[PDB]
Amino acid sequence: MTETDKKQEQENHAECEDKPKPCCVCKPEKEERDTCILFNGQDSEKCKEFIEKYKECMKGYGFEVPSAN
Numbered sequence: 857m858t859e860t861d862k863k864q865e866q867e868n869h870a871e872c873e874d875k876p877k878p879c880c881v882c883k884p885e886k887e888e889r890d891t892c893i894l895f896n897g898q899d900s901e902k903c904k905e906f907i908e909k910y911k912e913c914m915k916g917y918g919f920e921v922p923s924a925n
Contacts, residue, residue, distance in 0.1 A: 878917075880913060880914075880916045880917035881913065881917055882909075882910055882913035882914055882917070885906060885909045885910055885913055886910060886913075888906050888909075889903065889906035889907060889909070889910045892905075892906045
């Protein structure tokens with residue numbers, strides 16, 4: 857539970873991975889989507905999985921589709 861966590865950790869001081877992680881977004885699943893498109897999609901039955909995954913992402917993130925990205 858929360859209190860099981862929030863004391864301190866003291867795992868890593870050297871916070872080398874200067875890479876903020878907003879969560880949701882849709883990076884990998886977009887990349888997978890456009891990759892599926894490129895391979896054998898445009899329309900196809902084989903891309904719908906990634907197209908669906910592409911929306912839930914952004915809906916959750918809080919944008920019902922981007923402007924253009």
